[PDB]
Amino acid sequence: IVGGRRARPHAWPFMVSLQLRGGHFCGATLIAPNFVMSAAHCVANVNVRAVRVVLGAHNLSRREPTRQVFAVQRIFENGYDPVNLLNDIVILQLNGSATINANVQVAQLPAQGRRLGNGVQCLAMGWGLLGGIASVLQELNVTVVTSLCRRSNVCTLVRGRQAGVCFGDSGSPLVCNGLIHGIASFVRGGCASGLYPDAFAPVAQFVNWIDSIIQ
Numbered sequence: 001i002v003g004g005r006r007a008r009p010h011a012w013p014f015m016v017s018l019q020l021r022g023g024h025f026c027g028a029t030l031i032a033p034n035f036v037m038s039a040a041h042c043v044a045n046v047n048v049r050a051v052r053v054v055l056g057a058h059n060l061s062r063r064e065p066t067r068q069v070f071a072v073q074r075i076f077e078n079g080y081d082p083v084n085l086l087n088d089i090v091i092l093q094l095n096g097s098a099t100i101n102a103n104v105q106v107a108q109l110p111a112q113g114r115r116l117g118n119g120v121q122c123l124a125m126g127w128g129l130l131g132g133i134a135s136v137l138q139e140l141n142v143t144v145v146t147s148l149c150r151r152s153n154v155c156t157l158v159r160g161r162q163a164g165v166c167f168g169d170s171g172s173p174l175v176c177n178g179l180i181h182g183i184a185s186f187v188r189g190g191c192a193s194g195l196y197p198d199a200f201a202p203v204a205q206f207v208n209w210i211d212s213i214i215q
């Protein structure tokens with residue numbers, strides 16, 4: 001996250017860190033005790049048997065007792081199309097069930113087909129590049145836009161300054177009106193261009209599919 005701020009510890013207990021040999025590479029969202037959802041591009045060309053799923057984290061540079069660590073049991077995809085940058089969603093079924101507590105909670109999703117108007121205020125977040133990489137979870141105020149976007153993405157922009165998601169924020173939630181409306185998918189013009197809106201997978205379009213998998 002470029003131009004964001006540190007989150008209050010555990011303010012976002014659905015927020016997940018996807019890791020290889022101890023290092024963050026992508027975000028995810030806890031959507032049920034034994035399921036997270038991320039961006040399909042996070043896991044493409046990655047051996048998932050190597051991925052550690054980290055719930056309850058805040059400072060990735062610190063040893064944290066609040067954490068719960070899982071392996072990926074199974075993955076579900078929905079027509080990931082990297083050429084067109086479409087359907088950038090993946091569900092990762094965990095090798096066990098999260099212990100739901102103060103620091104580890106399941107996110108709330110919108111209803112199928114639910115659309116966001118131009119000018120809705122959302123929050124982006126993640127452990128990605130700061131402009132080094134983040135130790136503490138960062139958050140950022142962003143605004144939903146349609147100029148330079150498509151119907152098959154939720155796009156957001158910070159106005160009046162250069163701020164936005166960046167490398168390592170991929171897969172992370174976008175929270176709008178208390179609901180997970182986006183999964184961080186792609187940037188144009190590099191990170192925090194001040195010209196091109198950030199693009200997220202439109203979680204509302206995939207709600208029926210998500211529910212059929214989790215329940």
Ligand SMILES: CCOC(=O)C1=C(C)N(c2cccc(C(F)(F)F)c2)c2[nH]cc[n+]2[C@@H]1c1ccc(C#N)cc1
Binds near residue numbers: 084171
């Ligand atoms: C195959 C792996 O590619 C990447 O890792 C990409 C990354 C990180 N970002 C990327 C970079 C910075 C921040 C983010 C974001 F928005 F997810 F936080 C994504 C990116 N930007 C533009 C193209 N890409 C590609 C990309 C390719 C296909 C799709 C789809 N569908 C989405 C992104």
Ligand SMILES: *[C@@H]1O[C@H](CO[C@@H]2O[C@@H](C)[C@@H](O)[C@@H](O)[C@@H]2O)[C@@H](O)[C@H](O)[C@H]1NC(C)=O
Binds near residue numbers: 069072096
């Ligand atoms: C689920 O897996 C947890 C951690 O698994 C670890 O990470 C993966 C990616 C591999 O490196 C694996 O060898 C590691 O053990 C366990 O701590 C936990 O006990 C598992 N839950 C089960 C099977 O009940």
Ligand SMILES: *[C@@H]1O[C@H](CO[C@@H]2O[C@@H](C)[C@@H](O)[C@@H](O)[C@@H]2O)[C@@H](O)[C@H](O)[C@H]1NC(C)=O
Binds near residue numbers: 175177179
């Ligand atoms: C910056 O963001 C703050 C929090 O945003 C609100 O809560 C999050 C979790 C989402 O549900 C989002 O839709 C909400 O707007 C706001 O309280 C604050 O007013 C924002 N400031 C501005 C001017 O953007």
